[PDB]
Every structure is written in structure tokens, then in C-alpha cells.
């Protein structure tokens, strides 16, 4: 497909699948500072899947690369806030990251291919 717009619905569907994963539940809404009072000492830019979905639905992503950067920030924040690489919530992040990367690969490839076809002449 050379459809330059198709990534948006493909990302909406992938976010729906991520919301059906039990592994996403800790990453759905902005982190709880009352539970994790040091969190914002450690993490410069909070990110969560509800923020990503709202940004997409507002029309405030230009490309699936930008959405991918925010989703990867959810996972780097978990890797950097975790007190242990054997932690429950951290291990949930690693499985969910593998699922996300498996699905986003085609979305990025198709978008970049569509843009190259648009600029072919
Ligand atoms: O508090 C939340 N999430 C909430 C709170 C209300 O809704 N979602 N956390 C998820 C993100 N997070 C981690 O990545 C992590 C790694 C090791 C321990 O925690 C900190 C805890």
C-alpha cells in the first residue's frame, strides 16, 4: 500500500491490542507519585499509553516514528525507574516492548515506503 495516512488507524488498532494485554495495566495512565514519591527525581519525561492514544486522537502526531518514540519512552522510563532488572513491573515492560516492536515494524516500513513513492518524481 502507498497510503501515506494508513499508519494512524494501524496505530489505533495496535494501541487497542496493547490495552487488552494484562502486561500494559501499569503503563496505561500517568505514574502514581503518591506510591512512588522519588519517581520524578529519576524520570525527566513521564509517558503512558493513555497519553499516546490521546496525542494520536488529537491529531498531534505527524508520523508513526513520533508515536514510536513516545512508546519507547514508556519502556526506557521503566528500565530507568526499576530498582531491579528482576522486578515484576519491569519484566511486564520487556514482554510488552517485544510485542510492540513485532507489530510496529510493518507500520513504519509501509509509511516510509509510501512517502518515498510520493517523492518518486
Ligand atoms: O505506578 C505505576 N503505574 C501506575 C500508577 C497508577 O496508574 N499506573 N507504575 C508503573 C511504572 N513504573 C515502573 O515502570 C516500575 C519499574 C519498577 C517498578 O515500577 C512505576 C510504577
Swiss-Prot record:
Where Phosphothreonine occurs along the chain?
A: 45
The name on file for this protein is PH-interacting protein
Q: Which residues of the whole protein does the chain here span? A: 1315 to 1435 of 1821
Q: What does this protein do?
A: Probable regulator of the insulin and insulin-like growth factor signaling pathways. Stimulates cell proliferation through regulation of cyclin transcription and has an anti-apoptotic activity through AKT1 phosphorylation and activation. Plays a role in the regulation of cell morphology and cytoskeletal organization.
User: Where does the record place it?
Assistant: Nucleus
Q: Subunit info?
A: Interacts with IRS1 and IRS2. Interacts (via bromo domain) with acetylated lysine residues on histone H1.4, histone H3 and H4 (in vitro).
Mark the residues carrying the PTM Phosphoserine.
1, 91
Q: Which disease is it linked to?
A: Chung-Jansen syndrome: An autosomal dominant disorder characterized by developmental delay, intellectual disability, autistic features, anxiety, hypotonia, obesity, and dysmorphic features.
Q: Report domain Bromo positions.
A: 2-107
Q: In which tissues is it expressed?
A: Expressed in myeloma and epidermoid carcinoma cell lines.
UniProt source species: Homo sapiens (Human)
Amino acid at each position: 500500500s502507498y497510503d501515506i495516512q494508513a499508519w494512524k488507524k494501524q496505530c489505533e488498532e495496535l494501541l487497542n491490542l496493547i490495552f487488552q494485554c494484562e502486561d500494559s495495566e501499569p503503563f496505561r495512565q500517568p505514574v502514581d507519585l503518591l506510591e512512588y514519591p522519588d519517581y520524578r527525581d529519576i524520570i525527566d519525561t513521564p509517558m503512558d499509553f493513555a497519553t499516546v492514544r490521546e496525542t494520536l486522537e488529537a491529531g498531534n502526531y505527524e508520523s508513526p516514528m513520533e508515536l514510536c518514540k513516545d512508546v519507547r519512552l514508556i519502556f526506557s522510563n521503566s528500565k530507568a525507574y526499576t530498582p531491579s532488572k528482576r522486578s515484576r513491573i519491569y519484566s511486564m515492560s520487556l514482554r510488552l516492548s517485544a510485542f510492540f516492536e513485532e507489530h510496529i515494524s510493518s507500520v513504519l516500513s509501509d509509511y516510509k515506503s509510501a512517502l518515498r513513492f510520493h517523492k518518486r518524481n
